[model samples]
Target: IPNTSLFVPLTVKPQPLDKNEVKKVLDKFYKRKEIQKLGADYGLDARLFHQAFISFRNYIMQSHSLDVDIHIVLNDICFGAAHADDLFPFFLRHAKQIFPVLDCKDDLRKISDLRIPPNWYPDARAMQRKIIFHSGPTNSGKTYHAIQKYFSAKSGVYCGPLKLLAHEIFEKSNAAGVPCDLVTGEERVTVQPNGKQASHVSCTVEMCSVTTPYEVAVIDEIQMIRDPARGWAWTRALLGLCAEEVHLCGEPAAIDLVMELMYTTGEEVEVRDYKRLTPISVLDHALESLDNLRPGDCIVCFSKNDIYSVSRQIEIRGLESAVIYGSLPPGTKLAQAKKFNDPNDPCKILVATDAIGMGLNLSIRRIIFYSLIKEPITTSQALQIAGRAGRFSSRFKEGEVTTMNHEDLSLLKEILKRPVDPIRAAGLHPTAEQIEMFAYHLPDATLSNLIDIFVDFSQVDGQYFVCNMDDFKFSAELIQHIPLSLRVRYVFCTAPINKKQPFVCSSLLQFARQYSRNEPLTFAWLRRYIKWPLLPPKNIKDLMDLEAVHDVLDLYLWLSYRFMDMFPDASLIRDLQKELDGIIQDGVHNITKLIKMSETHKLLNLE
Candidate 1:
């Protein structure tokens, strides 16, 4: 028998993988005809064998060797002595020996340590804050009640999940004479006149202040604690907010997790449930077709193309429509939503994606599902989208939800009848401190390799798991060569770049390179390199170009927060964002008109 002991390393020094080397190993393995026959004889599926081979190749490239028996391992795989799923775990169990310098054992233990909330603000904990959870279904007045309490407080803060929601609260509070300041990732507006800070602040959850004490702090969309990408913000607010009373508003799904987290902080808890002011029920029958679509009906689809296609079809059928999707500029979404909400506006019908399912208050009387396929729509998702109907104080007192096809109707009905599953745990990430510690210990490791190893091996306590690190991993690799402090590089790694947009990625890399060279980043300097696309996009590609411009501006705003003295022109940036917003709105209008005009021409030719 081959010596399995030879595969186990006695001592090792971990090293980063070379992509070229890994590819060579895969090539040599694949070129062997006898290995294929051996795999088949062992009853192994070709695809599984190939996958296993690739994984093992990657593992070997990233790990150190202490006489690792590569030939024996390959033979075992070919003979089906080792299963595909067992490959990664087999490597992990020996990771300590394979990467002796990596501190893999301690790093994983720290991941478990992170499950317990860190006492980052011990001063706040001493205040013994009381947590009041206002939970219910959509249109149940949960947020409304929480905001009322917030407004009634002598001094308070409102932390919302969306910029638009924060802006809305800012406007409402200021208009109500409460004098609230607005702080979001992209924009900040102090209370008027002399632009002074106000006692009450309305900001995005991520912007919530842990150092400042407040009489009340209201966190909206508390259910977002279940989100893998953003739940950390909610968790931070719950653990660190320095308030006498903290009000949480969202669905009932988060109650158990919230209570558990709050219990750890030794805070008193109170639960309040609300019922919807207006009734929302499933339609007895499905809409016969899009031809039967009516005013006040908000059609939901998953993709941008679907949203536009449905809107175009509705317009072609002699009905005016408004479109909203996740990628649409916030200004454009707001305009579209306003048009749909206005009873007097010609755009009576609304076409949107699940972006409408959140804290957005719309005048939707009925919800029509254009597609309810399993890949995009799940039980919880279907319920959230269905909940958009019959918003409180809307024109309609009763709401109706229906599906476009017979197959979707049963799914929709079943989803409506079921409550969302209880959230067992919130998402967690290593704090800046934890990451710094890792960097200090692994002085020679590339940031990308460190992040990948940490993610693969880290264990969490409770219901939390590691967050998806696709963008972070990509950003880390891109910035690895730049000369900067570990903290600065980590900040860049966390910068929100839409990896799908090549223009955005290019802009970010350019920024990173400039910053690494100690080049001053000024508004004038940025203007010299980046120019906004012309308004009313001459073609579809211009629309994309305009979006890229907007994305660059967003990057500038994000950078401004980190390098305050370097990027001091926040007001100037805001002005540019507003100008771009107007141009984008016009561009969208022109594009829609062009599409409608072309459709008309096609029909005329058909006639």
Candidate 2:
């Protein structure tokens, strides 16, 4: 029934029980300012119902089963009531629902109760998982060794923090004669090339399935577990993998937390350490002039504005530079970086925002920091960006990192020299099922309100953290008026898109509304919001607009796979998406070649 039997008959002494001792202590305890404020008016303030407690207390002791002293009972009552009060604040709506709350306590247990998340995937828990952490800095062979296991295993999966890396593994797997299926948030490509099921998968961390047991599982970038937004996927993948052998590749910072957290899952972890496959060094002095920039150099900027400004200036020096900013289509960075990597291409220099760190194969000879504190880029980020230089090339065997300003040189030196703090916990999120159950109890609550309620009441082990829900809450509120089922709505809220972007926000509303109405969707419908006659962008604003247009198409593709029958146009529009990406890449490549100069002229006294 309710939390009714907090009382237990005890054996301590033969002393007679004084009921008033517990009652007064109960009265004083609940009356304390903090305790009273916690419950406000509705908690188990049992002291107010004085006569009823005595009636209840008398029965527990009436059978002469009380072998304990009054003092022992007093302590029990004191601690018990405080514990009971802690459970209710989030579960209860208000004072009016008190009677049903008790009568339906059994019914509410599943929704109101919190369980070990490891229980979410019993298949994984059933196996004796050996989580081998391949720990090291960037440019190490950590991921290479882990992927070897994934490919060698008869059946396994490779999980990465970003879709690009996942795509890389997917491409590499298929090219190596091991047909690997690709699973994104919205689409699952089951590549049964021989009509036999693909025995392996390469997917974004969130896309890995725990239902199927495997010989191996590899989670790359294990250190992403500290990311405030998406770390839950890493945590979930690590804890929920059903593989007999699991591998994690990332920095040593996450080693301690994974070691401790694995104890809870009954999994043993062995940290295998590694060093950089390529030696990277920090240069002693800054480059005082843009004229001093070399063919294989990259100027790292943190903001898109800074990136464009620097790109524009280098062009003034009659040099063509490839630029990468967040606004470009996802693969466009790869395309631009490829041109920069090309020995024959005129675009030998690079000017980019922090996407350079995440960029693959730029294999830069030098990374010159245009600014350090532009935005909130960290030492870890600086190290990652700088490490990308001088990789996998006999010509540039040793990487060099330096700052553009002499003032920033010493600080940059220290950043390269220091070690980062250990990751303390992995991110967690309330499951969709949990949110759905909570929805039933809170029928009147908006999804927005439900988010707030869950955040306030949900409990998790100290090692697991609930990810930041600001975006979740915002997405929920954006479609609050839509009439989708709670479960479906919860899934939509967790879609990976910036809800604040006007095009994305509007597109989500349109899609959610169309789906709720059971209306069929088409590429024609997509064209109403996106530019249908896709063309290359000319300016930064045009580039941004095209990027937004591409994002809407991407969202449509995601939703198309989700509501396949109603939105059966992903195949029809997939080419459009790919074409749009190429156009954006072409657009970014042409950006610097089209005039942009220079503070470093001071080094030469304006020669």
Candidate 3:
């Protein structure tokens, strides 16, 4: 039964002609090095590549109708014996004679061209199948339906624009007996928290991955699909998500795109209307009417500065308020929201940014926008912020938009009244999975036509990773540890930075300053820094005796002072300048050259 002809054919097709005799010919051409090199050069995962190889082998066997046992044995013998032994010439001579159309050069080229496309315009069908975009004007029940769908999942992942929102969802999920986790690149509550929590994860879209296979994924602030840098996260999650259901909640325009994505992915799509639950008739013109802000009222600001300003104003008036923004820690932000939302709490005023429009499920009574633009006011942003008031619920509500200037008032009204245009819902150009698949197929395919495949076969999301000289810096110390340092020196014979003019000294200084500020040195810091100097020519333990500079005790004190003084200010700059001078005084200037010299001098071992 296992060797049935139906299951394993034996030379039955048109006299079982070998025809071009591709197997016999290509046997010599198949080089292990070539396969491995091609695989690694193009980020092809081994599992995927080998799987594709097996598929290709099966296809070949079926097409030729060869003896299944002999085919398998021959394939194993050739691939495992001769081909694996670096006897590629044997395979190559026969391969070309049998398969004249086979082009190894063309195939390698094709594999290397596995690039994601840009400028993806999604049609209605693709959007509806891919993303569950559900946003509408104020008083629409968008969040309600989204929340309902989120609760339906055994394990769900929620992508929030703010930590407060993520925490809020985390709390709700916990209360519903659904254990949830939080990830915002700031804190880690789950173990092995490298974004591997299949448990309901309330994270920013920037970190969302359907690769973990969550059942449901709810992404808030669906409107951020237009974000230049971070928008790709939203787009990637929407397009690449393999979840059973994805709920997209945000502005109506983004919802339109979400619906199209949902349709493309063959997922269920639902749009819930949003409606306000409070009556917010404006009594005064400039938000001063909120002097009596109760527990339900939310004072919204556009900027972090404005949030602080409003908080100060409210504090001066003896009104209880809590500050909320994207910058605050998730736990802290949620606590602040909970206090402000509490009925008994004196902190009745919730001072927040547009982030308040998401994350927190507060029954906001009165919503006041301090400024139309929080960061950079765009038409979409203006609408999104204004739409935050009077969330959808059983209760009907109306909120007021007050501005000090008549022009702002008019602008706010215009933003509110302007007809919401549905955004162009573009599906993913080539999804991550597809790109991965293409990468697998590349080694045997012609690359000249590869771009056409990516463009025609994949969703083309125009943005991609380009080398940005202005953005990043290669650490000189780190470079020494790289495997190619010797070869690089043999060829270039100098540090890359030194080889270049102007040295990028200003940018380097800026980066160094930021590095210092972000990582103020303590004993722990010194230990870590010594252990990892970006590129250490010696083991981390070698720096234990800072005694050559000063005793370990003295060095510790100096480093402690340095750590405490590591902020950006006149004093910090002066200190850094002094440190620079000291380094040069110690004959350690030209860091790269010094490192190379140290290696040559045996002061540091090249690991």
Candidate 4:
């Protein structure tokens, strides 16, 4: 019965009908069977039920008269009345005690209420830190100063934008007895000082450990924060590094944005500007012809074909040339650079792409631009490539820059005179928390569509905007088909894969499949499937294939770093990588010789 108070007290209030009236009310409205069944189903204690009923009854009696529609209030309590504004106030006060279902009202029911930029490294942020800004041109001593501080620190890290640069620091620090450990996406080398473990570390910017505290941290290529693709890593390093002294080395373009970000961090920032120690000047005229090419000149081209063709022309002219391009393996490129820089080496003339623009120290006396309009090369890009011409202490203390075609002479001159644009904002992305929370709200949306929508709608507080996800979205779509966790998917999306290269895409997918199955990704297996040639290529196409294979190996190394236990044979992979590098170096030499011979035959009408 709705109003039945089972086993009432002896001194209960007197009523006209007593138990008979209560029994009639319960039978007419609640029914005797349903009331008893519901009480048993709810497992409600008799005392609590009695107290709730008494409280509700008192509230109804105080608010409404006996002549009121009893069914209206009864229905309000049972099936929710539509026009019950008069009863809402009392319902709010007594609903908790009367209804057991209202207890979960405080529980979280939606995912959109999450915080942005969720403290990714709260421990790092808790420390008081300072920033030393070393801003200058490409050939300036900005990195030099930063490295000096890094070496002097008791324990510190050198964070570079490239693995080669990190390795350079590692070698230099270890040579200096500081005993730095090298960490990159693809490799790690530890050095011990006097048989003791290393306290210093040199790593790529992405590999920085925010959880570890350091006496100093040197972050190179700070201007990359403005890049739409990989800027988030730079931003993370700047904002999350737990170091007492943070040294940033880069072009002046990023100074404003860095200062703005540092201001919010409440860190003391000091800006030190530097100038190129050596002199650089524009040549009086463009190269009249390829005949004017000199021994120490580096002919800059944008594409591999152009680099080879130009190098062929120079080789036909009887000048040994060392070629470098973006696709060349890092080891091959370094070897070529060494040859070009060596005084005893006959390979004096260098033909290359902008790959020699940064993180390379070459003894180039002149920069001859083969083609400058292949793409809209920015002022910073042009300057970076041109700055490679002269080194302060090298044989070439003064540098000259010119172009082969007259059409590009004016453009090159103009770019050289133009100043680099200041960076306004850095790239930002949704944190893991944000993505996971967003996934809850968009259950049916594909990962690609979800990333697009999130990037479109997410807001950041300061000078940061969402990074472009066009290339990453394609990878995300492919990764979504594989059985992997959301975290792994995000890491793969952020991986450096050349979307244009099918070999790279296929190899990465294969790795992902093997990773999902918990299969061992060994170098032996990779060689069997990819068929990495042990010998140098016979032609340029074979060389191109070798480059693709190298990229696949790089992908393997990158994955190995992220999943250490899954990819336990990084050492063996490195050994294979070195072998591939040797093959690539031989291939480069063979191709250059073939090109020279072919060009010579054509010139002599022997073909």
Show pairs that collide, candidate 2: 312-596, 313-597
Choose 1 or 3, whichever is better by TM-score.
1
Q: Which candidate is the best by TM-score?
A: 2
Candidate 1 lDDT by residue in tens digits, 1-607:
1112212133333332345644554566555676555544443235434544554455566656523454355445545674333333344334433433323445544643564564666868778799999987778888888898888898999999888889889988888889899888877777667876788999999889998899999989888887888887888888889999999998788888888877777788899999887898898778858888878999888776676567677767878788776766788878878888999997888888889987467898889998886375766677778878888778888888998876778777886676677888877676666677766766666777666656655666675666666778798887777888888888888888888888888888888888888776777777656664345665445666777878888888888888777677766877777788798787665555645554465332211
Q: Residues 1-607, candidate 2, lDDT per residue (tens digit)?
A: 2332321212222124455664565456445666555543443344323323333344433535543443344555556644434423322322223222332334455564444777877888877899999988777878779998888889999988767777888888989888899887655677885766589999989888888888999998888898998888898899888898999988888899998788888888998998888888888789878999998899998776677677877878888888876667777878887888888898888888777666366768999998888654677888788888877643578888899999999988887777788889888887787778766766666787666666655566777777898888888988999999998798778776766579889888888898899987787776655757877754555677778878878787777766788778887778778888888878777775322212242121221
How does each model score on TM-score? 0.80, 0.81, 0.48, 0.78
Tens digits of per-residue lDDT for model 3, 343-374: 67777767777776555666566666666664
Query: Which stretches of model 3 miss by more than 4 angstroms?
Result: 1-131, 137-140, 187-199, 259-274, 277-299, 303-320, 373-376, 391-398, 405-407, 425-523, 526-607
Clashing pairs in 1: none
Global lDDT scores for all candidate models: 0.73, 0.73, 0.48, 0.74
Q: lDDT tens digits, residues 320-413, model 4?
A: 8898887788888888989999989988999888888876778999998888865678898888888887888579978989998878888899
Off by over 4 Å in 2: 1-41, 44-115, 194-196, 393-395, 593-607
The CA-based lDDT of model 3 is what? Answer: 0.48
Q: Candidate 2 at 125: error in angstroms? A: 1.2
Q: Model 1, residue 40: what's the lDDT?
A: 43
Alpha carbon deviation, residue 387, candidate 3 (Å): 4.1
| By TM-score: ranked, best first | 2, 1, 4, 3
**Model 2: how far is 529 from its true place, Å?**
3.5
Could you report the Cα RMSD, in angstroms, for every candidate shown?
Answer: 9.8, 11.2, 19.2, 14.1
